[PDB]
Amino acid sequence: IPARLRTLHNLVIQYASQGRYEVAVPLCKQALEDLEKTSGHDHPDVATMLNILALVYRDQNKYKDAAHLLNDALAIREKTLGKDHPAVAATLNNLAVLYGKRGKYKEAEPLCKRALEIREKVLGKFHPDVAKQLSNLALLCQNQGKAEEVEYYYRRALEIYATRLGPDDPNVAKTKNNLASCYLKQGKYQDAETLYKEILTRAHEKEFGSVNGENKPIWMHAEEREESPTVNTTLRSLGALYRRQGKLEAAHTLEDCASRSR
């Protein structure tokens, strides 16, 4: 936000979060035609202005129009700033968020790969912000039913989350679970069970010290009995996974464990 547009911003910000669409839009519209004569159209502050009103149309559910503004901001940003510049990836992302809210997922997908390619160059292939861009771009492929890609990007995100960050890490457990869902969505049940196990082995290794032969994880006590907020879901998922297999003496165990742990 520039110093110049910074005092008008706070007011529109205020006159939007008060449901005064009749006040806010003209304040933007007229402040844009003002700056349009000042520093030309292809100036970055028009692009910044076209992004603040675009966020006004998004704020009061007029997505058709919101994106019409963010493509214009993107055209300016592409011009002066650059084809592979960070602020152009930023507006290639905000524009993709709008396509998803309108249901145009097939149409947000090419924007999100470009927002990623800019991130891959800027931050480096293995940066954790690349892992969140991947965890996003996979959700988009899921909303398209492109399972094979959903699997790919989550695994790519997991590679960064697991390697760059720690083991107990929330994203490590969350991305495992998301990939574990994807595997089931495609009938890769051993792959899914494997993941649901890993999360728990670590979860038990976190609060019970370490994995022994006499102090094993829940799933191991459950598979033998048959003869983290993200963990309540793992327990519920894996539990019901044993249900498919017929392992009911093992399904009830985690289902009992899940209802207790809250």
Author numbering: 194 to 420, 445 to 479
Quote what the paper states about this structure:
The TPR domain of KLC1/2 belongs to the 42PR motif family and consists of six TPR motifs (TPR1-6) with a non-TPR region of 40 residues inserted between TPR5 and TPR6 motifs.
In order to analyse the structural impact of LFP-motif binding on the TPR domain of KLC, especially at the TPR1 motif, we crystallized an unbound complete TPR domain of KLC2 and compared it to the previously solved KLC2-TPR bound to LFP-motif. The structure of KLC2-TPR[A1-B6] adopts the common KLC-TPR structural fold composed of 12 α-helices (namely A1 to B6 helices). Thus, this TPR1:TPR1’ contact alone is not sufficient to stabilize such a dimer in solution. In the KLC2-TPR[A1-B6] structure (this study) which is the unique unbound form, the A1 helix exhibits a “IN” orientation, while in the three ligand-bound forms, the A1 helix exhibits one or the other orientation. Finally, because of the crystal packing contacts at the TPR1 motif, we cannot elucidate what component of the crystal packing contacts or the binding of the LFP-motif triggers the A1 helix reorientation observed in KLC2-TPR[A1-B6] (this study) structure.
